[PDB]
Structure 1
Amino acid sequence: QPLNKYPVVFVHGFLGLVGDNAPALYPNYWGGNKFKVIEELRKQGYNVHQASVSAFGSNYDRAVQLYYYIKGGRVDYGAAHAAKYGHERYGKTYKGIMPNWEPGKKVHLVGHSMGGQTIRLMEEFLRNGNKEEIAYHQAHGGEISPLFTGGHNNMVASITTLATPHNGSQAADKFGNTEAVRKIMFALNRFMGNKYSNIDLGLTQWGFKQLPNESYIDYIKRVSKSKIWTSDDNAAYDLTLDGSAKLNNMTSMNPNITYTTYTGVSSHTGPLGYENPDLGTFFLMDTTSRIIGHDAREEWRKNDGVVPVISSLHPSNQPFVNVTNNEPATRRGIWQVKPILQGWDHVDFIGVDFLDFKRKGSELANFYIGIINDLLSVEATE
């Protein structure tokens, strides 16, 4: 029946909220009003889905949630990890988009921003398990999620990344992960965990859910004891250069998977060597773009508003090949780097810059159909 033999799962980045979990007024993540990715691709005959995973959590908490979003079941972050970071072992429970997901039945994974990192960690868990959980289950018995055991291959056909900070972003190191902004973020999470909230921001495993009989005052008091306030097991840390390099160091190439990256630039060179945002960079990124563009190291400057080009092209020290837009993108085991999209800021990729009339719906539609054609090539040349 569907044109693609393997389902496509789109994975959102940091601050992303999709589907039922989006606030009452909030942009449609995959395509804004420009090209409604999920709905239009379904209409054309493709089987596509929009994953929903923590908007503020770590790559690790998100990757476990992605496994359960696809497979179904109750999220198990692992006993060793829960105990090490001081959050709940068990999280939400998902119905599962493909409850029969197993070696043989594969999925295509497409990630935007942080979603690109989360996809890689999940593949890493399927193939290799999680050593600390294996050791923990060895020493203490109990149950271990099959996500953590390793040995599970032929489950992912492809990994495609769009403006992913594979090597981190200075917009995290210098704002985002600063004390003052982590506090803003975490206050927002506490608020949206109140007894009348229908929207889950992705940190309830740290205690941010007010109980039905608990006053707000007591809730503030309970949740100020949470480890979240000083932990690294969160997105803001993960997106920093250190945080993303930890992830690069624990991943490896799968020789069966087709890897491919897209990257945009939306900065231009100032007469001093520094990069400044183009007119029509989504305006919420004027400051983050300047921070990146004024880096001491010249090759870290060119950026999309919030991720530097060097971070998006591919994980550093992982094999890659610059590829053209024409040729098939059909090589396995190697990051295929697509030519830089000129004038595309971070959010032009998902269509939510409603202020920018140069980036047209017809264009974004061609962009996503181009990905889908590549994914169909991957299937045809298996």
Structure 2
Amino acid sequence: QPLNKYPVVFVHGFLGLVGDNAPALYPNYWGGNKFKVIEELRKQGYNVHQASVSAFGSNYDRAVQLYYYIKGGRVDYGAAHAAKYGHERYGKTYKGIMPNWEPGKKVHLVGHAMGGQTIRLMEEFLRNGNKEEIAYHQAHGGEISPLFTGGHNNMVASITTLATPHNGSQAADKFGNTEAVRKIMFALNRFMGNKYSNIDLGLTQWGFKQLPNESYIDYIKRVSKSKIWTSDDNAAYDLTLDGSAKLNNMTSMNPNITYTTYTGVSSHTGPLGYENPDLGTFFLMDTTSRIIGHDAREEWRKNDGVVPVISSLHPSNQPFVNVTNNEPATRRGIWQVKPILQGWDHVDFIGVDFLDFKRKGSELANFYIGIINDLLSVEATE
């Protein structure tokens, strides 16, 4: 008899692993130890879920996977897409969080970081389809994912993003999308798809799963021919300013959806004008914070360690309204931009910063409850 009418689905970001796909030393993504988001919200009688999608994949690959996580079924990336980039057309097959999902049965979407981008792309497919795949199916018949088809409306009540780089991050452009870092990440993925590998890093469609009677040397040889080593079809490219601007250019406001965003700052101004990470910013984003904070362009400097403020507030070409923290946030068709959370870094939003004693568990519980309240407001208006 769950307290919320429409299921809330939490979508993780760029290096996210959840539930049983998360290795033992890797922290619990949604809330760390500070506030176990899924477990606690269920205990208070809300129907909430934790989507599991590709950790290194493109927003495209991930948006397809999100739909199959919700609906159930075998992941189909689309024949045209597959062919264009050089990966497998079909992926893993999900049970489904609601096999019933269709117009009239709504879902709430909350994304952390890249999850916010993934949410947006999935909804665009539901509503307007994918031109390229529709053309391809027109020519070559066969099957087509309903995701690619268009006309699916009233499937999502709300899109709410937490520290999402709507306008990219220069931490991707300057580090991270470089050949040097992509090669390291892809080797990790190669290794992690060995025949004994417990976990799945999200790039198995590119070949990164060792077959059962195939030697590790043969595996390496096979997969060295993959187009992944050079493709834009991966998270690192989508997180760049260009990548993210592409997503912005082909998404748009649903007049019926309730849009809302949150943002952290965790950097402070030096004498010069440039921006450095506060003590208490998760030490792993120290470098990225500095790259962003030392941008030539003043507006692009304040950041949460990994994504600049101007990127998190809203997609830049899409309509928005600044909103105070306690007003009901129930306005449809427009990005409702919440006040910047002072001293929250990128990862404070999900409570995994075990070193930050100044960001307490009860504060995190309030932030999440606060989101659930807003979702109830959406439910309670039409």
Which category describes the TM-score, using the shorter chain as reference length?
Answer: over 0.9
- What is the alpha-carbon distance in structure 2 between the residues aligned to residue 94 and residue 69 of structure 1? 6
- What is the alpha-carbon distance in structure 2 between the residues aligned to residue 280 and residue 62 of structure 1? 31
Report the alpha carbon displacement of residue 164 of structure 1 after superposing the two structures with TM: 0.0
Report the alpha carbon displacement of residue 142 of structure 1 after superposing the two structures with TM: 1.3
Deviation string 1:226-250 (CA, Å, 9 cap, x unpaired) is 0000000000000000000000000
Q: Does 1:7 align with 2:7?
A: yes
Report the alpha carbon displacement of residue 326 of structure 1 after superposing the two structures with TM: 1.2
Deviation string 1:55-84 (CA, Å, 9 cap, x unpaired) is 000000000000000000000000000000
- What is the alpha-carbon distance in structure 1 between the residues aligned to residue 228 and residue 317 of structure 2? 32
Deviation string 1:312-367 (CA, Å, 9 cap, x unpaired) is 00000100000000100000000000000000000000000000001000000000
Q: Alignment partner of 2:249: what SS?
A: helix
- What is the alpha-carbon distance in structure 2 between the residues aligned to residue 355 and residue 144 of structure 1? 47
Q: Does 1:204 align with 2:179?
A: no
Deviation string 1:195-222 (CA, Å, 9 cap, x unpaired) is 0001110000000000111110000000
Deviation string 1:260-319 (CA, Å, 9 cap, x unpaired) is 000000000000000000000000011100000000010000000000000000000100
Deviation string 1:8-50 (CA, Å, 9 cap, x unpaired) is 0000000100001111221000000000000000000000000
Q: How many residue pairs end up in the alignment? A: 382
Q: Alignment partner of 1:177: what SS?
A: coil
- What is the alpha-carbon distance in structure 2 between the residues aligned to residue 326 and residue 140 of structure 1? 53
- What is the alpha-carbon distance in structure 1 between the residues aligned to residue 83 and residue 323 of structure 2? 44
Report the alpha carbon displacement of residue 100 of structure 1 after superposing the two structures with TM: 0.2
Aligned to 1:271: 271
- What is the alpha-carbon distance in structure 2 between the residues aligned to residue 210 and residue 345 of structure 1? 37
- What is the alpha-carbon distance in structure 2 between the residues aligned to residue 346 and residue 122 of structure 1? 23
Which structure 2 residues correspond to residues 32-181 of structure 1 after superposition, within 5 A? 32-181=32-181
Q: Alignment partner of 1:372: what SS?
A: helix
- What is the alpha-carbon distance in structure 2 between the residues aligned to residue 252 and residue 187 of structure 1? 36
Report the alpha carbon displacement of residue 167 of structure 1 after superposing the two structures with TM: 0.2
Q: Alignment partner of 2:105: what SS?
A: coil
* Identity score, percent: 100
Q: TM-score, normalised by structure 1?
A: 1.00
Aligned to 1:221: 221
Q: Alignment partner of 2:350: what SS?
A: coil
Q: Alignment partner of 1:133: what SS?
A: helix
Deviation string 1:144-200 (CA, Å, 9 cap, x unpaired) is 111000000100000000000000000000001000000010000000000000111
Q: Alignment partner of 1:245: what SS?
A: helix
- What is the alpha-carbon distance in structure 1 between the residues aligned to residue 43 and residue 102 of structure 2? 27
- What is the alpha-carbon distance in structure 2 between the residues aligned to residue 161 and residue 48 of structure 1? 16
- What is the alpha-carbon distance in structure 1 between the residues aligned to residue 108 and residue 176 of structure 2? 30
Q: TM-score, normalised by structure 2?
A: 1.00
- What is the alpha-carbon distance in structure 1 between the residues aligned to residue 321 and residue 115 of structure 2? 22
Aligned to 1:251: 251
Report the alpha carbon displacement of residue 94 of structure 1 after superposing the two structures with TM: 0.2
- What is the alpha-carbon distance in structure 1 between the residues aligned to residue 130 and residue 278 of structure 2? 43
- What is the alpha-carbon distance in structure 2 between the residues aligned to residue 368 and residue 345 of structure 1? 16
- What is the alpha-carbon distance in structure 2 between the residues aligned to residue 310 and residue 39 of structure 1? 33
Q: Does 1:29 align with 2:29?
A: yes
- What is the alpha-carbon distance in structure 1 between the residues aligned to residue 20 and residue 30 of structure 2? 14
Q: Does 1:231 align with 2:231?
A: yes
**Which runs of 5 or more structure 1 residues have no equivalent in the other structure?**
none
- Which shifted more, 113-122 or 140-149? 140-149
- What is the alpha-carbon distance in structure 1 between the residues aligned to residue 354 and residue 25 of structure 2? 15
Deviation string 1:96-155 (CA, Å, 9 cap, x unpaired) is 010000101000000000000000000000000000000000011111111000000100
Aligned to 1:369: 369
Q: Alignment partner of 1:349: what SS?
A: helix
- What is the alpha-carbon distance in structure 2 between the residues aligned to residue 238 and residue 46 of structure 1? 33
Report the alpha carbon displacement of residue 88 of structure 1 after superposing the two structures with TM: 0.3
- What is the alpha-carbon distance in structure 2 between the residues aligned to residue 53 and residue 285 of structure 1? 23
- What is the alpha-carbon distance in structure 1 between the residues aligned to residue 48 and residue 287 of structure 2? 35
- What is the alpha-carbon distance in structure 1 between the residues aligned to residue 8 and residue 311 of structure 2? 24
- What is the alpha-carbon distance in structure 1 between the residues aligned to residue 325 and residue 117 of structure 2? 23
User: Stretches of 4+ moved more than 3 A in 1?
Assistant: none
User: Cα RMSD over matched residues?
Assistant: 0.4
Q: Alignment partner of 2:349: what SS?
A: coil
- What is the alpha-carbon distance in structure 1 between the residues aligned to residue 26 and residue 306 of structure 2? 20
